[PDB]
Design a protein around this ligand. Sequence first.
Ligand SMILES: *[C@@H]1O[C@H](CO)[C@@H](O[C@@H]2O[C@H](CO)[C@@H](O)[C@H](O)[C@H]2NC(C)=O)[C@H](O)[C@H]1NC(C)=O
Ligand code: NAG
Ligand code: NAG
Ligand code: NAG
Ligand code: NAG
Lengths: 236, 234
Amino acid sequence: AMDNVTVRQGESATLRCTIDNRVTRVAWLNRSTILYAGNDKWCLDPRVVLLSNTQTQYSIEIQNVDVYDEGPYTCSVQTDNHPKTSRVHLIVQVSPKIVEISSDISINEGNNISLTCIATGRPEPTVTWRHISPKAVGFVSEDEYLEIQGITREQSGDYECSASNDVAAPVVRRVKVTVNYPPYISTLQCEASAVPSAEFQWYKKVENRPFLSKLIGNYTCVASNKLGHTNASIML
Amino acid sequence: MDNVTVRQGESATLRCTIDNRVTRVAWLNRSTILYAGNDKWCLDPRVVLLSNTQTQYSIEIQNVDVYDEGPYTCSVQTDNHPKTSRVHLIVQVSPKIVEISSDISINEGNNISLTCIATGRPEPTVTWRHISPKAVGFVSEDEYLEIQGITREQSGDYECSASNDVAAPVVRRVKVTVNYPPYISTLQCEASAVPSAEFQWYKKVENRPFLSKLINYTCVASNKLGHTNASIML
Ligand SMILES: *[C@@H]1O[C@H](CO)[C@@H](O[C@@H]2O[C@H](CO)[C@@H](O)[C@H](O)[C@H]2NC(C)=O)[C@H](O)[C@H]1NC(C)=O
Ligand SMILES: *[C@@H]1O[C@H](CO)[C@@H](O)[C@H](O)[C@H]1NC(C)=O
Ligand SMILES: *[C@@H]1O[C@H](CO)[C@@H](O)[C@H](O)[C@H]1NC(C)=O
Ligand SMILES: *[C@@H]1O[C@H](CO)[C@@H](O)[C@H](O)[C@H]1NC(C)=O
Ligand SMILES: *[C@@H]1O[C@H](CO)[C@@H](O)[C@H](O)[C@H]1NC(C)=O
């Protein structure tokens, strides 16, 4: 005749037991074991402290509760006509915690990559992957295990893992992915995009910005990185 | 894995071995506490303290009923580790035959069927016995007994026997009578019939039920099922 009780890990749980009329003796039990009988402290664990022994209600408190303390707890009352008992289930909760994620990586285009996010908590959290890359389309997925086949430069960016249960606010940790792709070329200027940023070469001074180079007959622009090389020519 | 079993209306002894020293010990009936040390929690007098020594704590449950069946735990409190000892109490009821088939009369070569439903703890063993002398043996080891093409040789009482090994088995019998047309075997003709046939001579006189006596002629015995005549000439 009493509502379930639920507390977070490392908190205090109060187990109350309302009484009426007159009762000879009252007790609290942890499964079969006895915790308190009247004002007699059976179990010697200091976390269990008696709170109220007035006839109106009999209540104890469990401090610094762990998940192992979850289970049924009965308030064994004894009355002359019939003996009554009231069972109460203690439910412990653990905030979600991301135990493992893949470390930050840089990868060549067109390879197989994989991302994982192992999270713990009580109850089991719901893990989701989000593509956090700005200035690009994103996506959310309900797969803990995330695989990418034939990775493209369009898929570079951060990947945020989120593990959530109703116990606490979801916890997030992200991983930045940078995708390596050979350069593609786009007074005299030569625009190109590459990861890592490509060093330009001009062939028959010159200021080299990170995203483009400029030069102040027919000449060719050569853009190159560790993966490959491209040449583009322009005539003035 | 401790276990105890007692018959209804008897006394059951619940022992609990302990070692070293325990602050307080108890015996429990499911969730409720019966005794804690020398403190009598439950108000039922049937649970009496037997041993309050430190080495062992034992109680006894007298006048046990079927409602007293269930688990009983010996809640110990020790500093090093907490131990509990559960014991399952098992109550027993002598077998009781709730239902049997009523007596029947049947024509020879007909179908009959008999049942003997018995209850008890533990499960009783029901057996059917044909009480006709020179019998073969038990006829069914189940509640249900059926006979196909019943013969006059199978008429008689059928004893059901239910035993659960708790107490002496209870038995009840049912008589079946098989109807058969008469068959014949100064002038006497012996014959057998169910119902018993009255003899007639055709062509005083004392006619016993199982044979007739006369003080070309035929002796006629007949009943509700059929008729036969056997003739002899002097
Ligand atoms: C042992 O505990 C039970 C339950 O608290 C006592 O009461 C009976 O419980 C059964 C449930 O299985 C009910 O059907 C009965 O009506 C209850 N009352 C009685 C009088 O049987 C039981 O009495 C306890 N045993 C003893 C010896 O007190
Ligand atoms: C309390 O929690 C237990 C956990 O198994 C559940 O079985 C029970 O129904 C719950 N009771 C209420 C009142 O929610
Ligand atoms: C008894 O209570 C303790 C904490 O008070 C808890 O850890 C344990 O799981 C409970 N049940 C037992 C010991 O069977
Ligand atoms: C990537 O995964 C596919 C899956 O079938 C496999 O066939 C291939 O060998 C893997 N490696 C590559 C494409 O380099
Ligand atoms: C008797 O039982 C037999 C076999 O089970 C069945 O064929 C028949 O219909 C039953 N009734 C009779 C013979 O009157």
